[PDB]
Amino acid sequence: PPVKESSFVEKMKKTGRNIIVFYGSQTGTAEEFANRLSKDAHRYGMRGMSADPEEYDLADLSSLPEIDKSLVVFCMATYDPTDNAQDFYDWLQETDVDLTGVKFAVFGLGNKTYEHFNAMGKYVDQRLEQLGAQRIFELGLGDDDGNLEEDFITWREQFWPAVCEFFGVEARQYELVVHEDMDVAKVYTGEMGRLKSYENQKPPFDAKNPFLAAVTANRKLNQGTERHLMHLELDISDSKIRYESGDHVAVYPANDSALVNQIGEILGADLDVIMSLNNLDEESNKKHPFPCPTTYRTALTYYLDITNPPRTNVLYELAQYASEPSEQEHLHKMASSSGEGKELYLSWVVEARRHILAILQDYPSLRPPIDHLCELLPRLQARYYSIASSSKVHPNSVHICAVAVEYEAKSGRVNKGVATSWLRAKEPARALVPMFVRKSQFRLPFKSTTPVIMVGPGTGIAPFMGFIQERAWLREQGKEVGETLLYYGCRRSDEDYLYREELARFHKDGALTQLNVAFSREQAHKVYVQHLLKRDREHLWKLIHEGGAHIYVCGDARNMAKDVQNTFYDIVAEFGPMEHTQAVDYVKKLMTKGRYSLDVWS
Numbered sequence: 001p002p003v004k005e006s007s008f009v010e011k012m013k014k015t016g017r018n019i020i021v022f023y024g025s026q027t028g029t030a031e032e033f034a035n036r037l038s039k040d041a042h043r044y045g046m047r048g049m050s051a052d053p054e055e056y057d058l059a060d061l062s063s064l065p066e067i068d069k070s071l072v073v074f075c076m077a078t079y080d081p082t083d084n085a086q087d088f089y090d091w092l093q094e095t096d097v098d099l100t101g102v103k104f105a106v107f108g109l110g111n112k113t114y115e116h117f118n119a120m121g122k123y124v125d126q127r128l129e130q131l132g133a134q135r136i137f138e139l140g141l142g143d144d145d146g147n148l149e150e151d152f153i154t155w156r157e158q159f160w161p162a163v164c165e166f167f168g169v170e171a172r173q174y175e176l177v178v179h180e181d182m183d184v185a186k187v188y189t190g191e192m193g194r195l196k197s198y199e200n201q202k203p204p205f206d207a208k209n210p211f212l213a214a215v216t217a218n219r220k221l222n223q224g225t226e227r228h229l230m231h232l233e234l235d236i237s238d239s240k241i242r243y244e245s246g247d248h249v250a251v252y253p254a255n256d257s258a259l260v261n262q263i264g265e266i267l268g269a270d271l272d273v274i275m276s277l278n279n280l281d282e283e284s285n286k287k288h289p290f291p292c293p294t295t296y297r298t299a300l301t302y303y304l305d306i307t308n309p310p311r312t313n314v315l316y317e318l319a320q321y322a323s324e325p326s327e328q329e330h331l332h333k334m335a336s337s338s339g340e341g342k343e344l345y346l347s348w349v350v351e352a353r354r355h356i357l358a359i360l361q362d363y364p365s366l367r368p369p370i371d372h373l374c375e376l377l378p379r380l381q382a383r384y385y386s387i388a389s390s391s392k393v394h395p396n397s398v399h400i401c402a403v404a405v406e407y408e409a410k411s412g413r414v415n416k417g418v419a420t421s422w423l424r425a426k427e428p429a430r431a432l433v434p435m436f437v438r439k440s441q442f443r444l445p446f447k448s449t450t451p452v453i454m455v456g457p458g459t460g461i462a463p464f465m466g467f468i469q470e471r472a473w474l475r476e477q478g479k480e481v482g483e484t485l486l487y488y489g490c491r492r493s494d495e496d497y498l499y500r501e502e503l504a505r506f507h508k509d510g511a512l513t514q515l516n517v518a519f520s521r522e523q524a525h526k527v528y529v530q531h532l533l534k535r536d537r538e539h540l541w542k543l544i545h546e547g548g549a550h551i552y553v554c555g556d557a558r559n560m561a562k563d564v565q566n567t568f569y570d571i572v573a574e575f576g577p578m579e580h581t582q583a584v585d586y587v588k589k590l591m592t593k594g595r596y597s598l599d600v601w602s
């Protein structure tokens with residue numbers, strides 16, 4: 001609950017703004033979009049502004065009409081609503097205001113693999129119209145399972161024309177300030193929010209004031225040499241942090257130092273030059289791109305993203321810094337909605353997975369001002385992990401189960417995951433991992449006697465390591481505990497069976513009523529967790545139909561989770577009986593009555 005700003009409508013007036021793009025974002029992408037769309041109003045002889053719907057009172061849309069040819073755009077992501085867009089939502093639900101005269105557009109960001117695709121967008125664009133506002137352009141539906149960037153360049157290309165036409169209008173966001181005389185303790189060195197907040201830890205710890213927790217355990221859980229699966233233990237003592245199994249822990253990592261050095265090396269400049277990028281819109285909340293003042297090196301290490309494929313809007317803006325014509329032209333055509341330009345971007349940048357440095361190496365004429373480059377780079381996001389311990393057993397420690405990312409890219413070089421390569425490097429002593437916890441609704445039943453069915457192959461194991469530590473603990477405390485079954489899976493039982501001993505011990509003490517593992521490569525056919533579910537179908541239908549058991553799914557969202565959902569569709573279709581459609585509805589209903597929970601990630 002923060003303090004609202006002044007009515008945005010009034011703000012727009014005082015700065016001559018006629019377009020306000022609102023972004024609902026969780027990992028920046030919706031926001032990045034709203035800002036791109038914002039600076040876009042300029043080329044079209046208009047001026048706009050991005051704004052966090054949380055910091056404003058959306059009831060003020062009703063007053064927007066009072067600005068000339070005013071326009072409001074909504075870039076909303078689904079996670080329904082993201083944290084910052086919750087107010088708006090509850091408002092869009094309670095309010096009954098008459099938005100007659102409001103003109104809007106909406107570009108939603110989602111992922112098709114999800115149950116409720118772009119639910120937020122579909123909702124916003126469909127509720128504004130319910131209130132009296134008129135849609136100016138079609139609802140954009142972004143799919144991060146294909147290419148969101150392309151869906152966005154495709155919408156934005158048909159948007160602006162429809163806008164300029166409708167309004168009859170004819171067809172460095174931040175500024176740089178180098179620091180010569182700066183006091184040493186007044187310089188951010190990587191902390192996230194308040195200055196020196198990292199060094200002087202002061203509760204309560206959240207996303208803006210992360211608690212640097214000490215890595216007390218680092219271990220490799222697998223026997224092979226191909227992959228590196230690891231178990232870490234972060235110590236949250238004196239942090240005053242509460243958590244339950246199912247919850248997630250989030251961490252702010254550090255980029256690889258040499259990938260950082262080499263970036264200032266090729267651009268031929270120093271990273272230690274202390275600076276600041278002050279938003280040219282002196283009245284805007286977001287006064288800076290990241291914590292300023294600070295040195296390039298710091299920003300490149302802690303606040304910027306230097307490994308993900310650059311977006312089309314960044315390449316276009318960097319086109320002007322490449323001498324050689326051929327190159328300049330290539331960077332320029334990366335933002336096409338079709339053609340050889342849309343094809344080089346998807347294969348040479350995306351598919352190839354070339355980070356910012358790579359492109360600078362493969363296009364040597366590109367030597368941009370490191371100043372305009374930092375303003376273009378996206379902020380470094382924190383990475384989530386499903387806490388792997390019960391707080392009833394480890395109140396003062398948060399466990400993480402993860403696989404390290406390192407692969408060969410067509411780009412020609414070996415890429416490394418930012419968070420994983422970093423946590424990998426951290427071992428118990430000087431090792432501090434900046435963190436905080438985010439509550440989720442993946443939870444053990446309210447009643448201990450309620451049955452539980454956990455399905456989670458590979459890393460999807462980790463939340464369940466908690467559910468089991470808790471289920472077991474409840475029994476020791478004399479509580480009466482219903483069935484507790486795990487459906488895990490790995491390649492081979494002597495190669496990457498995670499927590500084999502702990503899971504054996506738990507089965508032994510009777511915590512785990514059933515330990516069903518699936519060894520995928522131990523035979524000709526692939527044997528996956530869903531094969532076991534189909535196997536134990538008769539008994540699983542019993543729990544579901546007569547036991548009121550909860551179902552859980554964790555790990556790969558891409559396929560594993562769909563395959564398991566489909567096998568649950570079949571178990572019901574058979575013992576219902578039912579026809580796959582009535583079984584789907586049955587399984588989905590289980591999802592709304594909170595008896596089927598998902599924790600899948602791509």
Ligand SMILES: Cc1cc2nc3c(=O)[nH]c(=O)nc-3n(C[C@H](O)[C@H](O)[C@H](O)COP(=O)(O)OP(=O)(O)OC[C@H]3O[C@@H](n4cnc5c(N)ncnc54)[C@H](O)[C@@H]3O)c2cc1C
Nearest residue numbers: 383384385386401402403405407417418419420421459601
């Ligand atoms: C809510 C949620 C829960 C999660 N829970 C856990 C969990 O508990 N345990 C866990 O291990 N992970 C989990 N993750 C994943 C985790 O957050 C990170 O995505 C993961 O650790 C990699 O992050 P990184 O910074 O190391 O790599 P990044 O720098 O973020 O790179 C990730 C990207 O690299 C690319 N990439 C990965 N491998 C290849 C390849 N071989 N070939 C081509 N592309 C590839 C993909 O674009 C991938 O998205 C979860 C993610 C979310 C969103």
Ligand SMILES: Cc1cc2nc3c(=O)[nH]c(=O)nc-3n(C[C@H](O)[C@H](O)[C@H](O)COP(=O)(O)O)c2cc1C
Nearest residue numbers: 025026027028029030077078079110111114117118
């Ligand atoms: C935990 C989690 C849950 C998600 N749930 C949904 C969902 O229900 N529907 C959907 O369309 N996309 C869903 N997504 C995908 C995001 O909407 C998509 O990646 C979006 O681009 C993120 O935008 P942001 O960076 O602006 O938050 C989810 C992603 C994560 C990580």
Ligand SMILES: Nc1ncnc2c1ncn2[C@@H]1O[C@H](CO)[C@@H](O)[C@H]1OP(=O)(O)O
Nearest residue numbers: 457458489490491520521528529559560
């Ligand atoms: N589609 C899927 N459904 C269920 N498990 C899968 C899966 N795809 C891969 N797996 C298995 O998930 C486990 C953890 O990664 C591995 O045993 C892997 O086996 P595989 O690698 O032989 O396909």
